[PDB]
Amino acid sequence: DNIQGITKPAIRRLARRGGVKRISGLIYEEVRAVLKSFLESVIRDSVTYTEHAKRKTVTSLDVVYALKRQGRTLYGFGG
């Protein structure tokens, strides 16, 4: 069981980091749901990248190119 890898005070401290003070109880489960729907496309795109690389280990440059294709470019892990 790894669907509860994140915990409720972690989302609470992330809300204090952003500026959300008062949090509802459904917000943590909706955050887990939007994390589920958010990571899936980029990770399956990295699986397509690794299939293009015809190997087993997912390399970091494939992750950077997948996040560049999705529109979520990250700086510091390639180039």
Next chain:
Amino acid sequence: DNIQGITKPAIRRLARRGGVKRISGLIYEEVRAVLKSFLESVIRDSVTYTEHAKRKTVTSLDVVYALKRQGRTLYGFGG
């Protein structure tokens, strides 16, 4: 003035296209301002395209290329 050429019933019919029941009297000036801002943001690129090309006609190809550069691409006028 040409910024007030899009009058009040024009924005009223636009809102009725967009499904509004009742509208306020503070909408129209901000609609005209954001329309002027969007027109400036697309026209600057659309005229740098025609200024590079040794031309003075702002061609439909230039405006569809400037629209494709800024995300919102149109279909039917090239490309």
Next chain:
Amino acid sequence: QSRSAKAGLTFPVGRVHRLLRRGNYAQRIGSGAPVYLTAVLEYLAAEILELAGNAARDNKKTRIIPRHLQLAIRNDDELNKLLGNVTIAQGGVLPNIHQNLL
């Protein structure tokens, strides 16, 4: 004997291979590549023309208008994933009054 008549293709596979060659994209293009490009463009064209034919069928007009193509591209979640950002000229918008105003 063209490369299109070697597989029953209709989209111009030799012209598409020419635009891939002299088109500032890459260096080499394999022989199995532009037939597959012709295949996927033919599948997309067949999908959008079948959707336009259905849109012309249920709207009692025997021709294809951009409103039919707009209702084709906007009433499908796979087409909203593919081309949910571009627009169609004189296509109009989606008629959908929200439930709170109703």
Next chain:
Amino acid sequence: VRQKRREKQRKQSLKRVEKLALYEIRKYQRSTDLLISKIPFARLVKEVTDEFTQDLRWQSMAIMALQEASEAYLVGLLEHTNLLALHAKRITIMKKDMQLARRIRG
């Protein structure tokens, strides 16, 4: 002047034959054509191009594509602000409703 006679005949035909706000929403949602008056919009985009110009010409189809793209962007922003307006328990929209969608899009 046979074109003028045909135009007068068509104008006479339109003058004789062709000639609770809930109806206009469902009416203007099935319309396909443009909705902004043409030559004042052309004068406006001529004034906008005067800021970043030189006698720069203008094709008519380019101004048509500009009018279509601007109408599409405006109805997109308006359809997105209607949801935030009704979310704040406002059937009547306000300028504060077209501030968050102008803010969180960028």
Next chain:
Amino acid sequence: RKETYSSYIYKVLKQTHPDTGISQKSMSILNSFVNDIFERIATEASKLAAYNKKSTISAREIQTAVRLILPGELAKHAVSEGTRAVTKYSSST
């Protein structure tokens, strides 16, 4: 005189649904759409070719690009159509 898909669009329209007519602006919209998705798959195939040391664009590069861009049902039907046409091409020269 520009290389337009218009006759090919009318040809592939006449095979499955010949009863529907086609206008000019809608046909130009179709041509611009197929050119847009063509250049998108072209730059994605060139990008994936320049990624991992394969300058030759084979069927592998463009099938990875089709699996990359399209959704799951669309990529499944597209890879089915592509495998069908590449068998029909490599069989009949």
Next chain:
DNA sequence: GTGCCTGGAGACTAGGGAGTAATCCCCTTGGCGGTTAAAACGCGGGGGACAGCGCGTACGTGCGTTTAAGCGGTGCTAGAGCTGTCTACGACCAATTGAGCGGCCTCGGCACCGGGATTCTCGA
């Protein structure tokens, strides 16, 4: 600081783009009339925006407890390069053909226009 391997720097010879003559030439920019559907001024209003109250509950906050879980080690395990070695492998210029554009001519449902049958008024 010290350093050797290698992309960087660069002139000479084929060989393909640049902008200046040249001329159509089509699209446009500018203005005159009309007429008309749309823009604007105003006026009563009523329905929707807005302030305030009732409340209760559920999260702000704190406390006992478990509960993985983090930091550090290290073998187990199995996935990522690199130099040889050989095979495919996609392009180059040229004769022949081709198939979609330039401009032309033919249908066909939609809107306008006239008769056959029916109904209304008067006359015979």
Next chain:
DNA sequence: TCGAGAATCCCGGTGCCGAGGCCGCTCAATTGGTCGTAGACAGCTCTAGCACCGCTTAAACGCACGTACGCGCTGTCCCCCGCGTTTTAACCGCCAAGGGGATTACTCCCTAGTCTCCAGGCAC
């Protein structure tokens, strides 16, 4: 009451401009012998993730005060809105000048290829 004649409902004829088809054609699509060059496999190592747990260890689970405020009701208050009325410039047609877009191409000039010599650049 008969009958002839005028009005109208419904059926049949005809412009008409956009969809469909077509002859002429002319710079690209096909195939080809060749040819420098990508590239796919393999020994071989080396190196990064995984499991167990040695040893600690803050942190979440969950229950209990308590009060801030989300939702709903009640009253307020006024601002766009339907509507009428007056104005006004948009659209259309048309007259007119002309100005950059498009097409042709040549010396020249800047680049692909070529070999030759040297100063950058992360590793020790």
